[PDB]
Specification:
Two copies of one chain form a homodimer. With about 325 residues, chain A is an all-alpha fold. The first copy, chain A, has twelve helices and no strands. In chain A, helix 3 runs antiparallel to helix 4 and helix 4 packs antiparallel against helix 9. The longest helix of chain A is centred in the middle third of the chain and has 35 residues. Chain A: Keywords: Deoxyribonucleotide synthesis, Iron, Metal-binding, Oxidoreductase.
């Protein structure tokens, strides 16, 4: 390289602020400069970021003409409409709950620039997901306030989001810190609540309901949007699992039998709430969909989430939706 | 526009829940605790939603832009020491500036912008800052620069540090866990943060840099870097427009905060930013390069400062001409 290809320092004291890769930590890292991306330590976080960036899509790119025609017709049963409406109601605000939590709760305490890069991509993706639900409401001529207010008006939805508020913990409190054992444990419970429970269990169950319509060639515009959402959420979940496991590895003292058991109990509570939600969606069942299938499915996926964070499966049920894993394989990171 | 079909309404089983549906006229940009901030609808601030849609339409990645010709030129003796200095100082400053801006959106601004459509835009903007950060890593890796030397520039170069230190100062107490915007004093402090990041950092401190880098691009030098900066400029144009709309919106809804005292303080902050940016330009350009001299930046930085002032309802103060009119093409 030619002469003059280096920045010359005129503050010699400042070279000390260059970041030692091995000093970097996922949480509680105040000893190095968090504003400098380099050198990247958590290559897994950066890879998630690059993968997410390659997945750009917008709901407005997906035509809704056939969906509008079907929705406005008399072809759908009231029970079919009920599944769609309840799913829209729950997702319309749940995306914002997730996005707001990334920004208002998680970001401050993930003291690492490459992980934060991913968080910014994820949060933007949640904004895209929120746009999706606005777009669907406007396209089909739904009462947008009725749909977006569903979590205040439908008990089985409220129950899930009230639980979400509970497991959010005090992470939003101005006094909240992660530099105690109890504090970092509370933080990890928040991560489990959002990545494992909301994104990894509540959302996957909604995906089955909606994609079951897509597979029947009903509401294929909504279906396609949900396929893109599933592709994003696959990465959200993978990142969250990696982050939880990373925090555990770097802070083994938090991973007590007590914390482990509580995480199991939260997942159990999520499973029960999602089953009750599925029953509210499907009081009689529709073509290809019964509540009993969600009992097995929700238990199955909960076992898969438990395994990924080093906990034993507890339900041992089989997956009644083998095709979900087919589209999951196609939408794999 | 077809008829609403029978059975197409979601039935409530919590009868009083309907009261939490959001009244459009109750929404506000700050201090809005009377309605549910989680529900996007109904959208009140159309300008915020439009910025969001515009940003989303602007997707790009630095890895899409070929660096072959740039690598070839960087290896050659066809780029002078002085030209290299301009490039490296700009890479040094921008490499961390993007993170400063992005971190401030998330850690300072988002909590206090109590409006979902504006928050939708903020998430787009913060992601764009991540793309800009990626851009500087990609440039470093492409040209084989010492990445730690580049990203640490704001700790190693006085003229860069001076800008970023001033930035830390105008960030104010907004990061204080117990900072609140629900007083005149609190909201004025918040507005100073918005001026500091949108107007000063994004609207002024990026501009000598844009001119310098795009000057190379216009001479067919480092066109890979140039193209990346063109995409950054496109994004930053929206960032600035959103910030101006946000500042003006907060003023309109809370006119009592916009005192002669605050107005004077903002002008003085902008004057100081101008001085610091002129000094930075001087550091970049101890000697002239083609179509670029440090003295030109006196006129330019003052000219853009006047333009920013006008946009937030303040009188221009410098009255200088723009030596780089091609920046508006
Ligand atoms: Fe998600
Ligand atoms: Fe910006
Ligand atoms: Mn989502
Ligand atoms: Mn930027």
């Amino acid at each position: 390289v030619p002469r003059g290809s280096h920045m010359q320092a005129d503050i010699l004291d400042g070279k000390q602020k260059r970041v030692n890769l091995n000093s970097k930590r996922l949480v509680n890292c105040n000893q190095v400069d968090v504003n400098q991306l380099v050198p990247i330590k958590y290559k897994w976080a950066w890879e998630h970021y690059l993968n997410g960036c390659a997945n750009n899509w917008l709901p407005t790119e997906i035509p809704m003409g056939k969906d509008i025609e079907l929705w406005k017709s008399d072809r759908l049963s009231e029970d079919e409409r009920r599944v769609i409406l309840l799913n829209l109601g729950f997702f319309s605000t749940a995306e914002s709950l997730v996005g707001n939590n990334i920004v208002l709760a998680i970001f401050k305490h993930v003291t690492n620039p490459e992980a934060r890069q991913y968080l910014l991509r994820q949060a933007f993706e949640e904004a895209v997901h929120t746009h999706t639900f606005l777009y669907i409401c406007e396209s089909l001529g739904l009462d947008e306030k009725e749909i977006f207010n569903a979590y205040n008006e439908r008990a089985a939805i409220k129950a899930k989001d009230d639980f979400q508020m509970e497991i959010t913990g005090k992470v939003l409190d101005p006094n909240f810190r992660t530099d105690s054992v109890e504090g970092l444990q509370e933080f990890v419970k928040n991560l489990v609540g959002y990545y494992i429970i909301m994104e990894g269990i509540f959302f996957y169950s909604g995906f089955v309901m909606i994609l079951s319509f897509h597979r029947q060639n009903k509401m294929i515009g909504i279906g396609e949007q949900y396929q893109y959402i599933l592709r994003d959420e696959t990465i959200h979940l993978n990142f969250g699992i990696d982050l939880i496991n990373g925090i555990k590895e770097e802070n083994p003292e938090i991973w007590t039998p007590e914390l482990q058991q509580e995480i199991v109990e939260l997942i159990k509570r999520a499973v029960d709430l999602e089953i009750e939600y599925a029953q509210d969606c499907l009081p009689r069942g529709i073509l290809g969909l019964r509540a009993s299938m969600f009992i097995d499915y929700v238990q199955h996926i909960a076992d898969r989430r438990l395994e990924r964070i080093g906990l034993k499966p507890i339900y041992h049920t089989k997956n009644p939706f083998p095709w979900m894993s087919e589209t999951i394989d196609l939408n794999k990171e």
